[PDB]
Amino acid sequence: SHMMLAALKEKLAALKEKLAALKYKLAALKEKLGLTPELAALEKELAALEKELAALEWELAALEADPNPDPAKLAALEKKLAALEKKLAALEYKLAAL
C-alpha cells in the first residue's frame, strides 16, 4: 500500500503540474487567437479537470492518513487518475493544434 500511495501521489503531482502549464498556455492562446468558442470549451474542460484533481487529492489525503488503506480504493484511484490523465492529454493536444 505504501508503494501504491507513493506512486499515486507522484502521479497526482505530475498531473497538477501539467494542469497549471496548460492554464498558462490557454490564456496565451486566448490573447493570440481571441475569445473563440473552441477556446471556451477547452477552458471549461480544464476547469472541470482542475476541480476533479482537487477532489481526487482529498481522496488521496484520506487514504494516506488511513493506517490500513483499502487496496480496492487505491486501485480505483489509480484508474480515476489514469482517466483524468487521458482527458488532460486530449486537452493538451487540442491546445497544441490551435
Residue numbers in the entry: 19 to 116
Can you provide the manuscript's text about this entry?
Here we describe the combination of rational and computational design to deliver three-helix bundle (3HB) peptide assemblies and single-chain proteins with control over topology and thermal stability. First, we garner sequence-to-structure relationships from antiparallel 3HBs in the Protein Data Bank. This gives core-packing rules, including layers of hydrogen-bonded polar residues, which are combined with surface-charge patterning to design complementary sequences for acidic (A), basic (B), and neutral (N) helices. Next, AlphaFold2 models for both designs are used to seed computational designs of single-chain proteins where the helices are connected by loop building. Synthetic genes for these express in E. coli to yield soluble, monomeric, and thermally stable proteins.
To alter thermal stability in our designs without compromising the 3HB fold and topology, we sought to destabilise sc-apCC3-CW1 systematically by modifying its consolidated, largely Leu-based hydrophobic core. As a control, we included a variant without a polar layer, namely sc-apCC3-CW-0NTT. All sequences were evaluated using AF2, which consistently predicted clockwise 3HB topologies with high confidence. Variable-temperature CD measurements revealed that sc-apCC3-CW with 0, 1, and 2 N-T-T layers were hyperthermally stable and did not unfold upon heating. Specifically, secondary structure calculations from the models all gave ≈74% helical residues. Thus, apart from the 0NTT construct, which coincidentally had 75% helicity by CD spectroscopy, there was no correlation between the predicted and observed helicities.
